Amino acid sequence: EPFDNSTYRNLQHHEYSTYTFLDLNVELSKFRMPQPSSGRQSPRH
Amino acid sequence: SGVNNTKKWKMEFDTRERWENPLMGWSSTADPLSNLVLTFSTKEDAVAFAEKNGWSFDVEERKVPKPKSKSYGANFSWNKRTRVSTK
């Protein structure tokens, strides 16, 4: 409310884990959409 | 990977007996026309020389590298199998 410019609030990164990035990427997948397909399952296929 | 030696026709003679010298082991031979190879600008001139000197010949046509179709983009294609797996 009083525009407390004097403090830092981006301290949420302190309580992060080893898998935090990948774990937070995991459940984010259900909000994604079907990826495009190039046909063959691999360039070598 | 240089082609500067594939621009002049050459005429050569069939290889003959090449035995070992009993003393030291050299490559003794009795064929004077063994190291003699002529050069010619065109096939027709070479065959003219062969017929002029009365030598039996067997001319082989000049092989030429077929023009290929190079493209850097094909290395990183999206649907085709030319996409490289390494750089």
Helical residue percent band of chain A: 10-25%
Which band does the percent of strand residues of chain A land in? Answer: under 5%
DSSP E strands of chain A, number: 0
Radius of gyration of chain A: 20 Å
Region (Disordered) (chain B): 62-87
Organism (chain B): Sus scrofa
Protein name (chain B): NADH dehydrogenase [ubiquinone] iron-sulfur protein 4, mitochondrial
Subcellular location (chain B): Mitochondrion inner membrane
Brief descriptors of the model:
part of a larger assembly, 2 chains, A: 45 residues, mainly alpha, B: 87 residues, alpha+beta, NADH dehydrogenase [ubiquinone] iron-sulfur protein 4, mitochondrial (chain B)
Q: Could you please describe the fold and organization of this structure?
A:
The structure is cut from a larger assembly and holds chains A (45 residues) and B (87 residues). Chain A is mainly alpha-helical. Chain A is built from 1 helix and no strands. Chain B has one helix spanning 43-52, and strands spanning 9-11, 18-20, 27-29, 38-40. Chain B is built from 1 helix and 4 strands. The longest helix of chain B has 10 residues, at 43-52. At the A-B interface, loops of A face loops of B. Chain A: It comes from Sus scrofa (Pig).
